[PDB]
Amino acid sequence: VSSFKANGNIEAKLGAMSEKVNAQIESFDPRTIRELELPEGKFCTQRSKFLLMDAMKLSVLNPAHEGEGIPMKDAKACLDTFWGWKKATIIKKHEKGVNTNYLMIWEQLLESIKEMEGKFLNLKKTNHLKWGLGEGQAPEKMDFEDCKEVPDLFQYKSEPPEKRKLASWIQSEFNKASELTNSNWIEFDELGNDVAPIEHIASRRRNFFTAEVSQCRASEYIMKAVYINTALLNSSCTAMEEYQVIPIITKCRDTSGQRRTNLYGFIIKGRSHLRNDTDVVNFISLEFSLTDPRNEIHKWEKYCVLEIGDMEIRTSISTIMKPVYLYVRTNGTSKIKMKWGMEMRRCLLQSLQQVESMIEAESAVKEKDMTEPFFRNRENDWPIGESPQGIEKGTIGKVCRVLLAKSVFNSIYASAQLEGFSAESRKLLLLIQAFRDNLDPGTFDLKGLYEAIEECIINDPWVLLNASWFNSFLKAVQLSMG
Amino acid sequence: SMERIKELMEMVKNSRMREILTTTSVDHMAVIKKYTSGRQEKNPALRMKWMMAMKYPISASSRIREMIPEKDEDGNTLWTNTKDAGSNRVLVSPNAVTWWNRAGPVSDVVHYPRVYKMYFDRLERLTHGTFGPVKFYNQVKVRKRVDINPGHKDLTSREAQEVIMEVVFPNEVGARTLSSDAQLTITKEKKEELKNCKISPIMVAYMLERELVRRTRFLPIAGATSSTYVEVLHLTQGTCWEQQYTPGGEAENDDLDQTLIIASRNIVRRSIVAIDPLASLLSMCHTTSISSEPLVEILRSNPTDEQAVNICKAALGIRINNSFSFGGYNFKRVKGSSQRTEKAVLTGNLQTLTMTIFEGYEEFNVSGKRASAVLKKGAQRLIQAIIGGRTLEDILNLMITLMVFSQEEKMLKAVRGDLNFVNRANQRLNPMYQLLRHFQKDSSTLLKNWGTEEIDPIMGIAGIMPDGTINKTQTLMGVRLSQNERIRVNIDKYLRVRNEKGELLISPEEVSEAQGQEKLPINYNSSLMWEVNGPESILTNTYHWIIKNWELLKTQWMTDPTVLYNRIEFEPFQTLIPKGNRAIYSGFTRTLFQQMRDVEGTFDSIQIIKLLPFSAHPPSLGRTQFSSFTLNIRGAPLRLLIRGNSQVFNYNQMENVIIVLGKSVGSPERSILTESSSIESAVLRGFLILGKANSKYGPVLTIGELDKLGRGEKANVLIGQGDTVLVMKRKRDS
Amino acid sequence: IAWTIVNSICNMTENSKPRFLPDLYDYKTNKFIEIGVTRRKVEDYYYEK
Amino acid sequence: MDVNPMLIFLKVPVQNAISTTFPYTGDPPYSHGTGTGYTMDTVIRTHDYSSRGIWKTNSETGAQQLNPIDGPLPEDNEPSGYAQTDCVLELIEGLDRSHPGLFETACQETIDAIQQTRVDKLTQGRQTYDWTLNRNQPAATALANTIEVFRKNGYKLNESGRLIDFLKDVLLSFENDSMEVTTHFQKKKRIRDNMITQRTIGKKRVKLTKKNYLIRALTLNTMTKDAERGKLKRRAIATPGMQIRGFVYFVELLARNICERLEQSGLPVGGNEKKAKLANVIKKMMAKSTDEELSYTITGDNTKWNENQNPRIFLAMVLRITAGQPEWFRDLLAVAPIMFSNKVARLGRGYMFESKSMHLRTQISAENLSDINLRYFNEDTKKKIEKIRHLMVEGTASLSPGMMMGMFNMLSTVLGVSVLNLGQREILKRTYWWDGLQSSDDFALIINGHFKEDIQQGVNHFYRTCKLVGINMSQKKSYINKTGTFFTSFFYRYGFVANFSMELPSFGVAGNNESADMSIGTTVIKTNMINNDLGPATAQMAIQLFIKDYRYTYRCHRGDTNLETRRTKSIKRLWTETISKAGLLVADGGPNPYNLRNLHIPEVCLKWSLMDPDYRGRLCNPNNPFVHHMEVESTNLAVVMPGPAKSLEYDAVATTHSWTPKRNRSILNTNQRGILEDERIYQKCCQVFEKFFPSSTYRRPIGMASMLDAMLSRARIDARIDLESGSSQDFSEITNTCKAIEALK
RNA sequence: UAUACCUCUGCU
RNA sequence: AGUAGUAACAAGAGGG
Ligand SMILES: [Zn+2]
């Protein structure tokens, strides 16, 4: 090494090396390339921790703050607003479960409520509840020596997930999540008074954002998520051995500024000796809904749906009475899962930072605060949808809600698949962008990238939907370009 | 001095730890201090959310049990007896922290803002700050290393450590010297300020550490780069906006001087381009303000010596700082300029001095005592010195003074021994005076090493030899012996500064084309100037104005283009072009435009927009080809390609936007422009581009090889960006 | 320690901090003491130190 | 109408809406079980890439050590680790050529560093594998254990108090064949009550053979990396042992001093400067070219970066870099490459089995994978168990070729840089030429030439030249386009744009304490407004949301709210008691003062004038028991992960809110229960030492002497001068005590 | 063997 | 059952 001096080695070794080792640039052209390959199999089931579009609220008028009052007392209050109860019957079964136990649990819960006093409510450990909360389902731990010679002793199943197919409902969910409502869902804490002009400008711009966003249905999901995950974490930590009831509550304000308390259903926590951040809490969700599950029975594989009552509703001209269902289920979560659920409000930041950047970019070139134009000067000029007529342009207000929904759904349906798909497809989007900027893009091994992407599309509705969205984008691009 | 030795006894009694106190060394004590069972938490956000749900998650010293009650008024338990893993510390509730803050022991803390000065100075500047209006425009930012610690009394880490040790740990100080008043005054002042403040020494040391030593960081910054402005970047700049703001406290002389030069330079370079530069300059001087202070009242009171500044001072009638004094004598510079350069140099004793060496030809009238001289100086060179005086001694004194002032290698080479002279107030004089008071006491070797010329005899002129003798035809290198008012300076329309004898002192062309980034904010209130500072601004706004007013200018391009070219909106753009290129650029451009008109059918408005501002100058009749125009921007010259997109001008069709230096200047006309199917003219002088190259016309040529073709002959040419094209020489001549 | 001694002494007097470490210190006259033993004569080491 | 947010990209360029392609608001992937399957996968793949190499059994270990360097040249685009020593040395030489006297000063700085470096410096840093306990431990302990063992055996040069002397001992320790180490085990006694069993820990001395100790010293632990984004499948990461740390420190310190002075080096600078370097190279590449030339940029990722980088080559590098330097310095640095060349890897926890019929589960140690029937496992697993057994030794597995994540740094980047440095016009002298920036596997490369085929030649030349030194560009994940757009989640589009979504996880309650979290929270918002284009409106909302999270997390809601927690009452007492409400900290039920202009001002500072004098006297009472006095070097510090792990400094005033939460207690049940007492005792000795040397908390006291002697010597003079020039009965009492103690051994 | 209890642990 | 996803949780350890 000390006495080494290069005469011309790399060129010699280069000459020696096989010609098969090359980096051939294949020029990139979107008009040529194919759509992504979506998987086949049974349709993807709902996997959220609570009902999204199909949820139903028993609400009451209540001037309290956001988070004041005993939740169970507020729950009892909401329970009263519904008159037309019934004896509970099973209308849609949970194919893999002892469905009678769900029915017993509902009645048990409903009675334990009627008979309680105080703040907290712990359910008695009945066997049909034990079953639903997975009591004792952990195989007992043994030294290897004492079980060396058992026939069926294997390592835990470690195969990749079972592939699933893209259903229509996940797109429907996003369509509703991306919509306005008639209730203020988000209540922001106070701020130091504005002094600098830019702080006045900020607050002026911030009011618009808060308007378009606080009423968006995705924000309601944020609050349900923050409430549920907070309640569960705290309950999990404090009451490790008890089966604690947690009512699914949110607070909001009418368009009149009138404060309202909404009850969606209940949650029944299992035991929670959580150690590792992945460790699981089992629980039982019990949520109200008008939606007939049988009209989309694939969406509800994991659910056992009861019918529990009836109520009247008015249409535009006509008016008719409909039945109310109780979507019951056993579900699970982990410290890390609900830690990130507690923080779902940051979804607001992801959306609004994108929007604000767009507003600012135009404000720069126009040399003027382009906020009031963008929001008040109403113009549909951002592609954000596809109808039979074709591509549809939306307003900046709509874009806020679309981007907020995207962020919120990225949180609700977090997954290694999404993590992978998002990472790899980004490269393809950039390659498409590069061509569209006429920068003469080139790829070395494209089908390796396609496989890298496609490997990540397995069974997650959100991932599947994003894969679809990418194709619809690809086609949309190919059309206007070709 | 007791309870510590009692404690130590009670400890040493126990063999458990007397083992340790004897076995483990003072070095190894550092190792066993960090010896812990505990892990660096991986997910503290999760853990804290988990733990705050628990009753007793906080750990506090056991003395808490004596200090605060076990149960509070409402029945809350404040502390328990369960001890924290690996500590003599107990587990307590957050209600303990609150009880303390509402009923615990009160302490004296009113001097704490002296300790946390670094923090409270942030508030101080903000509380006394003034907000202006918010301007919206393309905010270009330079990623640059800058100071983060405003009020950093600059001294190196160990130099600060010494000072800290002195103040908080006086007896347990190490064993080093206190360099100078730099450290001493800080130590005494900080010791005075922190006089008996009841607070942990560790905090005092820590705050001092954060306070004294410099800290820098790479940050994207637009405008003022001074520390106090860096402190509030988040408040003062955004993607598309500037929040005009002046922080409390007064500016720094160095910063003021620095930004003054930058302003004056810009004013000068702008004025040059205008008609009646002198009129344009005076206007800008009266309108411009630095850090919300009149540029004029600054120039009235500022001693800065710089060519652009002096041009402004001359224009405004303020006297230029041409004069100074050194070694007792008074120096007045009659021509040249002080081009200074910081350097380190070795004496004859191989001692390293730190000089502010001057470059360039300079001429001085030197007068003092009983001796006067004319001095001609080069970079570390005595070109000529003609000296006269009432006594040979007085002459020789001035000769020495000048031979020093020369900063020649000879004189430095000649310095034997070390230089450690110290002025009256125990002040160490600068190297220039050090070298003086040296040779003034011993100029023996200096004269032996200086050297001697033979020279031609001239009446009234004599030479001087190193032994003190006078010689008619021999003399020390550069020295001649031979037996005073404030000069009236004038300046003309075009900013040439002349003396009363009609000789050139300062030329605006000689002003350094250096685009350094200002320290303090500069605000021009001039129509001649764009709203924003810097060349990037000039580009973006220039190309922005064109697009906003496109249709109005497109017709103007057809009818009466000579007027379009003389639009004074194109003037600040010209400053970005080198002096000696504007004419041929504008000529080359104007002819390319004419070709587009002569040759009907061909039309490329984007090409027109791109090149239009280059047309704003009296053109030349040159016939040279150009593949790109150069633009001097932030030092490095950028090349705007004539054909197609560039880093400077980039038309993006996907966005339908012109992008200038990465910044959108706007969307060109609705769609009209994307629909421009044509064959390309207005790229070459007397040539037309007619699509892809065809090999039938032989081997490909280059732009330099296009003065050997018949009028009508078609040929292949490497036109740019690795593109060959078919080119035809047109018959007529625009 | 030694430097802590030096500093401790100079802090409770008006004595300047010596550059090198002395060997003893007289309290009555308040004088830092540098002892010098040698096989050579005396003036050599005296004027050396 | 069906909504599709990707359709935004029809109008908006992808870079400008890149925030939508980053799902960073949901929990990232986490590994539930063990990383044995991943460790084995790595170890297999590593060899499988070098399969054509030369196998040899190690003399001192018996490990099946594979050597691919100077092996056959590859002949396919698959990943390969067959680098070439002479080809490396050529690049390293060229790098020397292009930077006159860089290696000189680089080494020189490392020399002064080595000479001056205390042993203390090794207590800093990430956790290390403690060969003593066969588990990962904090550096401070992992070191202290090794030193104690060295001391109990015949090694005590480190007693000097300088890293190199400790570093010497490590090489000598390889000689002592019978290394004596103390074990701890759980015994059970019998207790009577005025009779029940009792648990208690006992110690058991054991001696290890050369074979063992040498392996344990060359052992590198393995784990699954968690919370990793962008990826479907988990990866295995590695943790080094206590032996090789000291050397790696100096090799990295050298490689750092090298990297600090290279334009094409992305390390060790921050994002703002990385972008400045990327700007510089583009500016330079465009200025250096002619108007009739092309420029292409390739967005670059190197596939299987660590698996295909060889310690032997690192040896070649370290030697060639040090060429002409003192041989003790030449040898000292060469250690780590060698120790890595002969590195062996632990295989984690092992596996867990499950009986459906019997409803039971069981654990099996990785060591047992040698002696185990393969009826339990599945195909992919049992095949891996097969392939690994040929390499497996003494529980661990030999890993001569390649590297693993989390072992070594910087020097690998110096390899990549030298290939970039090769691309100068003045070196290549072709119709094409190149330049760029690189950090680890990530690289951006600008290739210029006269024609598109000219560029192709440059791509291939660069690509093959990389292979000749064991660098495999990813043909799947790397791509190329005309210079204009293209690096480590930075996105350049005629200039660097913003990527705010990357930082979203940092917007929350950091969970250090009430005091630190407030400073971190506001600063996060502040630095993003500056660096990642977080606008005013969104930043205000960010303040709002943080306050909401801060208040809920710490149960410190405003004193006038009607919520009900465990604190609301005590916070209410305070609120009523208080006269100037605005002075109260958010942690004490006060109002949020913050807005865009305040973000850089600590809360206590910001509210100082508005505080009740009693309240602030209590709040900042320096005698409060909630804080525990740190050291200057650790004051106001927290830990953050962007990179592997880093310290984050924050600005805050020490108050009663500057507390630390409870420690983990699981260790109480384990055999290491005594470490708590060790810690409890060790601290108490420093607690009193500091009373004798308050200076020790600021600067570490350099001294080789009995801790007690130092305390006594001062205890005398303090006691004396406190009288001499400051009662003699107290003085005599102190001296009597000083002597009285000193008598006791 | 089963049922009750009791103690320690919740990143080790 | 359910969580989950290339391997785990569905309490672990002890009073054996
Ligand atoms: Zn609140």
mmCIF file of N, CA and C in Angstrom, chain B residues 324-387:
data_model
loop_
_atom_site.group_PDB
_atom_site.id
_atom_site.type_symbol
_atom_site.label_atom_id
_atom_site.label_comp_id
_atom_site.label_asym_id
_atom_site.label_seq_id
_atom_site.Cartn_x
_atom_site.Cartn_y
_atom_site.Cartn_z
ATOM 1 N N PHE B 324 -5.250 61.141 6.742
ATOM 2 C CA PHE B 324 -5.053 60.518 8.042
ATOM 3 C C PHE B 324 -3.668 60.910 8.557
ATOM 4 N N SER B 325 -3.218 60.278 9.638
ATOM 5 C CA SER B 325 -1.909 60.594 10.203
ATOM 6 C C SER B 325 -1.267 59.366 10.834
ATOM 7 N N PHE B 326 0.050 59.257 10.685
ATOM 8 C CA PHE B 326 0.785 58.074 11.118
ATOM 9 C C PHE B 326 2.239 58.393 11.456
ATOM 10 N N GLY B 327 2.709 57.867 12.585
ATOM 11 C CA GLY B 327 4.080 58.076 13.019
ATOM 12 C C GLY B 327 4.393 59.529 13.337
ATOM 13 N N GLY B 328 3.347 60.322 13.553
ATOM 14 C CA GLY B 328 3.497 61.735 13.846
ATOM 15 C C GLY B 328 3.195 62.616 12.648
ATOM 16 N N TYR B 329 3.353 62.061 11.452
ATOM 17 C CA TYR B 329 3.170 62.825 10.221
ATOM 18 C C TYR B 329 1.748 62.709 9.667
ATOM 19 N N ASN B 330 1.330 63.720 8.907
ATOM 20 C CA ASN B 330 0.007 63.739 8.282
ATOM 21 C C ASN B 330 0.030 63.323 6.811
ATOM 22 N N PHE B 331 -0.697 62.252 6.499
ATOM 23 C CA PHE B 331 -0.782 61.718 5.140
ATOM 24 C C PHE B 331 -2.064 62.139 4.428
ATOM 25 N N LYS B 332 -1.924 62.718 3.238
ATOM 26 C CA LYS B 332 -3.073 63.058 2.401
ATOM 27 C C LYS B 332 -2.943 62.405 1.024
ATOM 28 N N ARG B 333 -3.883 61.517 0.706
ATOM 29 C CA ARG B 333 -3.849 60.766 -0.546
ATOM 30 C C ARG B 333 -4.407 61.588 -1.705
ATOM 31 N N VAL B 334 -3.592 61.782 -2.737
ATOM 32 C CA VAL B 334 -3.955 62.649 -3.855
ATOM 33 C C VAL B 334 -4.410 61.841 -5.064
ATOM 34 N N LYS B 335 -4.007 60.579 -5.133
ATOM 35 C CA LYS B 335 -4.587 59.681 -6.117
ATOM 36 C C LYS B 335 -4.364 58.222 -5.738
ATOM 37 N N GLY B 336 -5.295 57.371 -6.167
ATOM 38 C CA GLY B 336 -5.295 55.968 -5.803
ATOM 39 C C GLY B 336 -6.494 55.635 -4.938
ATOM 40 N N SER B 337 -6.464 54.463 -4.316
ATOM 41 C CA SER B 337 -7.527 54.045 -3.409
ATOM 42 C C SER B 337 -7.014 52.973 -2.456
ATOM 43 N N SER B 338 -7.569 52.947 -1.248
ATOM 44 C CA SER B 338 -7.122 52.014 -0.220
ATOM 45 C C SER B 338 -7.747 50.633 -0.392
ATOM 46 N N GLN B 339 -7.079 49.789 -1.172
ATOM 47 C CA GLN B 339 -7.474 48.398 -1.347
ATOM 48 C C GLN B 339 -6.770 47.529 -0.310
ATOM 49 N N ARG B 340 -7.447 47.249 0.800
ATOM 50 C CA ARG B 340 -6.812 46.575 1.932
ATOM 51 C C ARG B 340 -7.049 45.064 1.927
ATOM 52 N N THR B 341 -6.076 44.327 2.457
ATOM 53 C CA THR B 341 -6.128 42.870 2.515
ATOM 54 C C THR B 341 -5.531 42.360 3.826
ATOM 55 N N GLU B 342 -6.332 41.637 4.601
ATOM 56 C CA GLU B 342 -5.858 41.036 5.842
ATOM 57 C C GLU B 342 -4.904 39.882 5.536
ATOM 58 N N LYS B 343 -3.734 39.892 6.170
ATOM 59 C CA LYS B 343 -2.747 38.832 5.979
ATOM 60 C C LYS B 343 -1.876 38.621 7.209
ATOM 61 N N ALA B 344 -1.159 37.501 7.211
ATOM 62 C CA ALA B 344 -0.161 37.211 8.227
ATOM 63 C C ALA B 344 1.204 37.131 7.555
ATOM 64 N N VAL B 345 2.216 37.719 8.189
ATOM 65 C CA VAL B 345 3.551 37.799 7.603
ATOM 66 C C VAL B 345 4.632 37.607 8.667
ATOM 67 N N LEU B 346 5.790 37.115 8.234
ATOM 68 C CA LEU B 346 6.903 36.809 9.128
ATOM 69 C C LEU B 346 7.953 37.916 9.166
ATOM 70 N N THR B 347 8.387 38.267 10.374
ATOM 71 C CA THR B 347 9.476 39.218 10.558
ATOM 72 C C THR B 347 10.809 38.521 10.312
ATOM 73 N N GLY B 348 11.903 39.258 10.469
ATOM 74 C CA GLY B 348 13.228 38.682 10.334
ATOM 75 C C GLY B 348 13.526 37.713 11.461
ATOM 76 N N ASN B 349 12.859 37.914 12.595
ATOM 77 C CA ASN B 349 12.966 36.998 13.727
ATOM 78 C C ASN B 349 11.930 35.879 13.616
ATOM 79 N N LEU B 350 11.313 35.775 12.442
ATOM 80 C CA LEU B 350 10.312 34.748 12.158
ATOM 81 C C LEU B 350 9.114 34.835 13.106
ATOM 82 N N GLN B 351 8.803 36.049 13.555
ATOM 83 C CA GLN B 351 7.593 36.300 14.331
ATOM 84 C C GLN B 351 6.450 36.632 13.378
ATOM 85 N N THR B 352 5.269 36.086 13.648
ATOM 86 C CA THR B 352 4.122 36.277 12.768
ATOM 87 C C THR B 352 3.266 37.467 13.200
ATOM 88 N N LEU B 353 3.159 38.460 12.321
ATOM 89 C CA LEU B 353 2.306 39.622 12.553
ATOM 90 C C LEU B 353 1.081 39.558 11.653
ATOM 91 N N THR B 354 -0.009 40.184 12.092
ATOM 92 C CA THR B 354 -1.256 40.201 11.332
ATOM 93 C C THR B 354 -1.509 41.582 10.736
ATOM 94 N N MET B 355 -1.233 41.723 9.444
ATOM 95 C CA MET B 355 -1.261 43.024 8.783
ATOM 96 C C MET B 355 -2.550 43.285 8.009
ATOM 97 N N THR B 356 -2.873 44.565 7.843
ATOM 98 C CA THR B 356 -3.881 44.995 6.880
ATOM 99 C C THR B 356 -3.177 45.598 5.670
ATOM 100 N N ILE B 357 -2.496 44.748 4.909
ATOM 101 C CA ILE B 357 -1.675 45.190 3.786
ATOM 102 C C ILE B 357 -2.513 45.835 2.684
ATOM 103 N N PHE B 358 -1.994 46.923 2.117
ATOM 104 C CA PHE B 358 -2.698 47.687 1.090
ATOM 105 C C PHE B 358 -2.157 47.385 -0.300
ATOM 106 N N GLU B 359 -3.053 47.363 -1.281
ATOM 107 C CA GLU B 359 -2.691 47.057 -2.660
ATOM 108 C C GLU B 359 -2.959 48.258 -3.548
ATOM 109 N N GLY B 360 -2.311 48.276 -4.705
ATOM 110 C CA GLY B 360 -2.575 49.280 -5.714
ATOM 111 C C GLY B 360 -1.675 50.494 -5.633
ATOM 112 N N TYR B 361 -1.564 51.189 -6.757
ATOM 113 C CA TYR B 361 -0.798 52.420 -6.841
ATOM 114 C C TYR B 361 -1.471 53.516 -6.035
ATOM 115 N N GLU B 362 -0.708 54.115 -5.125
ATOM 116 C CA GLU B 362 -1.191 55.210 -4.293
ATOM 117 C C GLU B 362 -0.173 56.344 -4.255
ATOM 118 N N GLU B 363 -0.681 57.564 -4.114
ATOM 119 C CA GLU B 363 0.149 58.761 -4.099
ATOM 120 C C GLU B 363 -0.238 59.631 -2.903
ATOM 121 N N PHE B 364 0.745 59.967 -2.066
ATOM 122 C CA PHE B 364 0.501 60.753 -0.851
ATOM 123 C C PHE B 364 1.320 62.043 -0.773
ATOM 124 N N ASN B 365 0.682 63.105 -0.291
ATOM 125 C CA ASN B 365 1.400 64.275 0.213
ATOM 126 C C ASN B 365 1.578 64.140 1.718
ATOM 127 N N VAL B 366 2.801 63.835 2.146
ATOM 128 C CA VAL B 366 3.087 63.600 3.558
ATOM 129 C C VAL B 366 3.781 64.820 4.154
ATOM 130 N N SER B 367 3.239 65.322 5.257
ATOM 131 C CA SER B 367 3.789 66.505 5.906
ATOM 132 C C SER B 367 3.633 66.426 7.410
ATOM 133 N N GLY B 368 4.663 66.875 8.113
ATOM 134 C CA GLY B 368 4.637 66.905 9.558
ATOM 135 C C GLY B 368 5.791 67.710 10.114
ATOM 136 N N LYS B 369 5.914 67.674 11.439
ATOM 137 C CA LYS B 369 7.058 68.201 12.185
ATOM 138 C C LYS B 369 7.830 69.332 11.484
ATOM 139 N N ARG B 370 9.029 69.022 10.997
ATOM 140 C CA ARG B 370 9.835 69.966 10.240
ATOM 141 C C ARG B 370 10.257 69.310 8.927
ATOM 142 N N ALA B 371 9.444 68.371 8.454
ATOM 143 C CA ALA B 371 9.766 67.607 7.252
ATOM 144 C C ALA B 371 8.513 67.278 6.454
ATOM 145 N N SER B 372 8.652 67.262 5.134
ATOM 146 C CA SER B 372 7.544 66.934 4.251
ATOM 147 C C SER B 372 8.032 66.031 3.125
ATOM 148 N N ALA B 373 7.124 65.265 2.531
ATOM 149 C CA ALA B 373 7.503 64.364 1.452
ATOM 150 C C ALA B 373 6.348 64.049 0.520
ATOM 151 N N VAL B 374 6.683 63.813 -0.741
ATOM 152 C CA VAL B 374 5.752 63.206 -1.681
ATOM 153 C C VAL B 374 6.053 61.713 -1.778
ATOM 154 N N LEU B 375 5.023 60.894 -1.594
ATOM 155 C CA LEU B 375 5.177 59.445 -1.577
ATOM 156 C C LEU B 375 4.380 58.768 -2.687
ATOM 157 N N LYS B 376 5.068 57.927 -3.456
ATOM 158 C CA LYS B 376 4.431 57.042 -4.427
ATOM 159 C C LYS B 376 4.585 55.596 -3.970
ATOM 160 N N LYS B 377 3.457 54.919 -3.770
ATOM 161 C CA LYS B 377 3.448 53.593 -3.156
ATOM 162 C C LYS B 377 2.722 52.552 -4.004
ATOM 163 N N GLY B 378 3.290 51.353 -4.046
ATOM 164 C CA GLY B 378 2.641 50.201 -4.642
ATOM 165 C C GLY B 378 2.372 49.180 -3.559
ATOM 166 N N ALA B 379 1.801 48.044 -3.945
ATOM 167 C CA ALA B 379 1.536 46.961 -3.007
ATOM 168 C C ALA B 379 2.832 46.480 -2.365
ATOM 169 N N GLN B 380 3.030 46.841 -1.100
ATOM 170 C CA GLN B 380 4.270 46.538 -0.388
ATOM 171 C C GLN B 380 5.491 47.030 -1.164
ATOM 172 N N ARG B 381 5.402 48.243 -1.703
ATOM 173 C CA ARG B 381 6.471 48.794 -2.532
ATOM 174 C C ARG B 381 6.599 50.311 -2.383
ATOM 175 N N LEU B 382 7.833 50.776 -2.220
ATOM 176 C CA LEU B 382 8.127 52.201 -2.245
ATOM 177 C C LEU B 382 8.649 52.551 -3.630
ATOM 178 N N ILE B 383 7.753 53.056 -4.467
ATOM 179 C CA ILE B 383 8.094 53.417 -5.831
ATOM 180 C C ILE B 383 8.988 54.647 -5.832
ATOM 181 N N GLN B 384 8.550 55.688 -5.130
ATOM 182 C CA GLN B 384 9.357 56.891 -4.979
ATOM 183 C C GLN B 384 8.959 57.705 -3.757
ATOM 184 N N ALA B 385 9.963 58.299 -3.123
ATOM 185 C CA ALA B 385 9.764 59.201 -1.999
ATOM 186 C C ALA B 385 10.708 60.384 -2.146
ATOM 187 N N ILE B 386 10.132 61.548 -2.424
ATOM 188 C CA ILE B 386 10.884 62.798 -2.488
ATOM 189 C C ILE B 386 10.694 63.575 -1.188
ATOM 190 N N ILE B 387 11.751 63.641 -0.381
ATOM 191 C CA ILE B 387 11.666 64.174 0.977
ATOM 192 C C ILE B 387 12.443 65.478 1.138
#
